[PDB]
Ligand binder design. Sequence first.
Ligand SMILES: C/C=C(/C)C(=O)O[C@@H]1C[C@H]2[C@@H]([C@H]1C)[C@@H]1OC(=O)[C@@](C)(O)[C@@]1(O)[C@@H](OC(=O)CCC)C[C@]2(C)OC(C)=O
Ligand SMILES: [Mg+2]
Ligand code: NA
Length: 994
Amino acid sequence: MEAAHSKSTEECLAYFGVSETTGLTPDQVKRHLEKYGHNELPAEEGKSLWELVIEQFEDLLVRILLLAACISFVLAWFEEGEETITAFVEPFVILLILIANAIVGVWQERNAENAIEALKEYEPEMGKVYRADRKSVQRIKARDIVPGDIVEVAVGDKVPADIRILSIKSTTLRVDQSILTGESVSVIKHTEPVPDPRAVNQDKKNMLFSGTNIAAGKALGIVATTGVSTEIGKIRDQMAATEQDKTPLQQKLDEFGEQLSKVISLICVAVWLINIGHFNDPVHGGSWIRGAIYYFKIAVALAVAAIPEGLPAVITTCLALGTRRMAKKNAIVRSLPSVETLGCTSVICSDKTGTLTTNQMSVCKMFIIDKVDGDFCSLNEFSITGSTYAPEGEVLKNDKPIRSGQFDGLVELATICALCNDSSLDFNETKGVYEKVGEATETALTTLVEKMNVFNTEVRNLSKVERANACNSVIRQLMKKEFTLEFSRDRKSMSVYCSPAKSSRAAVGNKMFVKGAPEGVIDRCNYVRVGTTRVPMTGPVKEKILSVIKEWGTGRDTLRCLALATRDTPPKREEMVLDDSSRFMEYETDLTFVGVVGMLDPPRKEVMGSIQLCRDAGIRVIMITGDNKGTAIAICRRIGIFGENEEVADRAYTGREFDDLPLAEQREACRRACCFARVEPSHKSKIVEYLQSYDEITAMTGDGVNDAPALKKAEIGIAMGSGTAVAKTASEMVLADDNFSTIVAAVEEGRAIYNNMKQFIRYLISSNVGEVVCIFLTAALGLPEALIPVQLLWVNLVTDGLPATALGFNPPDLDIMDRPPRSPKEPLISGWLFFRYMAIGGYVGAATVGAAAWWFMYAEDGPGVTYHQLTHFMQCTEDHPHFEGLDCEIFEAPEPMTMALSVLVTIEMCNALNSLSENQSLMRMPPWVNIWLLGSICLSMSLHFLILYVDPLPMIFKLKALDLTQWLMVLKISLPVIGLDEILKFIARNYLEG
Ligand SMILES: C/C=C(/C)C(=O)O[C@@H]1C[C@H]2[C@@H]([C@H]1C)[C@@H]1OC(=O)[C@@](C)(O)[C@@]1(O)[C@@H](OC(=O)CCC)C[C@]2(C)OC(C)=O
Ligand SMILES: [Mg+2]
Ligand code: NA
């Protein structure tokens, strides 16, 4: 393999020692295959169904539950017999939540798609080569093609390896490498070497890239690199060497797990110490075995009370909803977990042409020389109208209408436009619009022609399909297009050789019409054309031309300028080598300037507003274009990235200036830059790394397979809905309408989603805190189980999930896009907030335990234990004589439990209202603000009545409905919650740090 683009035609055949007429020999093929390997992109992640499920049981919180479901399965099995048929219900429900939960993880994943697998498609199944054992061409599998052997490709064929072209069999060879370079039109290939050893792929005119298509022609070539060493295999290597972090929330989740693990084990050490007097008890006492069942059975209650089981459900249904909500605004979010790391974006690098602008070119101004008398000079500037490609508009000189024929300068400018142009128009009936056929800036030229019919040829007497290429084909019949010197970035221009048509145009027949960048072609102009006559380019005339070119392309117009010229007396046809673009700049010299054409790519309207919102939201926007740095900047000023008068010396670099910088200033330029002139893929990936070294959340746009490694590296890669499918699969989101204003509409929902999603998380987390306080009082004291695991699940999954998912429908703040981007290191609960849940929890923990111990003691209808030990329920059946006058089975009564479960369920609807806002009082922000919330609270309550009054339900949850007075006890305990928090909110607002 090797950098063949520069060597030559023989230096390559020699390097490998292979004959262009024989190919590689069977022995060579064997050795080469051993040294370079097969022509493939490496294998895949052999992730097995067994490992995928094991991945499921590696979370700390999922393991903690699995252990509990076991301890609970052993209890609800052996020790505990008869008197209960529900044993196993507890272990069974926990297992469902797990195994069922793991299905989510395995389905979710099986439907996921690898960006690196998307490339595998750009590989032809087979290829055509010339081996040294058959004169006929053989057609083997692309997999066996090797560096060095002679390959043949023709139209349709998809290039099998990176090939260095030896000789073109056809008259012309056209390749389509848009996916790998971004070039829209099929490009022309050659055989002569490219001197530069560090050329970009756009300039390796003598190379075929594995993965592209042969648009036109047939040619032979020697295979340079194979498999992973090809321009596409090198991309596969960057996307694979790259590592995806994880949405900050997923990080805060690993953090919460580690903690909710340390705390749990502490709670047991604590509970154990609180009950240390037991080491001061009778050795023969008894109940020894019952005590262990109490602690083992409270361990399962502790675990299902600490972990928020409904959450994974509430979060993914909140995202899936928003997903659909964004999709109505052309933002197709692929990865859900990524909706969070969007609200946090601080920098947005967008591509210009398709996303920032319309990419719908049109000429607005023209100008030809009118007089050149010594140092005096007068131009002839025109204005044209029409923004579509539609041949409808007029040419107005000085605001005033004009007939283009009346100017001779304008007769030529119009041919150079219709002759030096590979693109045309087309009118369809389907949508009744004029559709650009070839290129955007070329089709804009044929359109210019139609609007200024210099010959005034009749046309209103024609249809619309035809009207399209009317004035153009009349000029096509006046000159005969011999050949054409294609565009190449070296000279930045193109031309066409044209001889006349008949004796009606015999005079000075052979002409050469060239159009290119102004600086370029104007240096090669020895004359100017004033009408039908001619003069020598002189200092004054040249400065008068270059200035107007500056105003047009740097002024508020931000027009892209084209200079058109002609080579009056071209070289003899025979004296031209029409197959080596290197010499092409020699044939386009000694020109006579004819005029320049200034066109415009109108920027999408809503873009100008989107840029403004980012200014307010505190997000930095970087424009990445191709325009020279002069107009690249101008475009920034027009849209808002830069101020009309704002300085831009250190905030706008070109790909070259940036490279010339030392790693230090390079990294410093990235924290202030807002526009990058001419950059390639190399650059898009470096800027991400620098933007990342400042711990920034960056968005990046792309469409080609060459944009894949950069989209994967940016926190959120935004692929174009019209770009390749490999880009889409390496991106978090896809802009259906390639509109930049769509990104900003998506950075807003992300902030909205996360704000709501932030509330319901704090909510659910706080109720878990309360259930833990309860279980911890119940055991520290010795009291009888107030709350059972089965009940807690119902609550965490259903009765709390409903008020939880409804909080996701909260009204978005009105200043969401006036605040800076959120920091990813912002914790969900800390400072004062940590203290309110610390207090609210401590409250419900008391309310639940208490409301149960109440029905025991000061209970209008139940046992009774004013101040004595109802806590020693463990030791009674045998201690009935000692303070125990009654039945030792009341301690398994349902009333106490449904007492404490009703105080939890209601203290939860209360807390769901305190959660409509972090610090806003309920008087200032009423519950009816969110209807879904109130409506879910009802469904929760009724859902609560269901498991009390039904039949199999009250039995399996161990709950017996409670009378109307016991319900009023629940309210008198619960409701005051809304007060304890209203008071805590008042604190935060008033007395405190704002
Ligand atoms: C949950 C039940 C119990 C019994 C418990 O023990 O919760 C503990 C206390 C604390 C711990 C959480 C481990 C948690 O760990 C962290 O990472 C912190 C620093 O962020 C954290 O401090 C907060 O929770 C969070 O942010 C969660 C963000 C998703 C507050 C919390 C929960 O206390 C309070 C009062 O909410
Ligand atoms: Mg691209
Ligand atoms: Na990415």
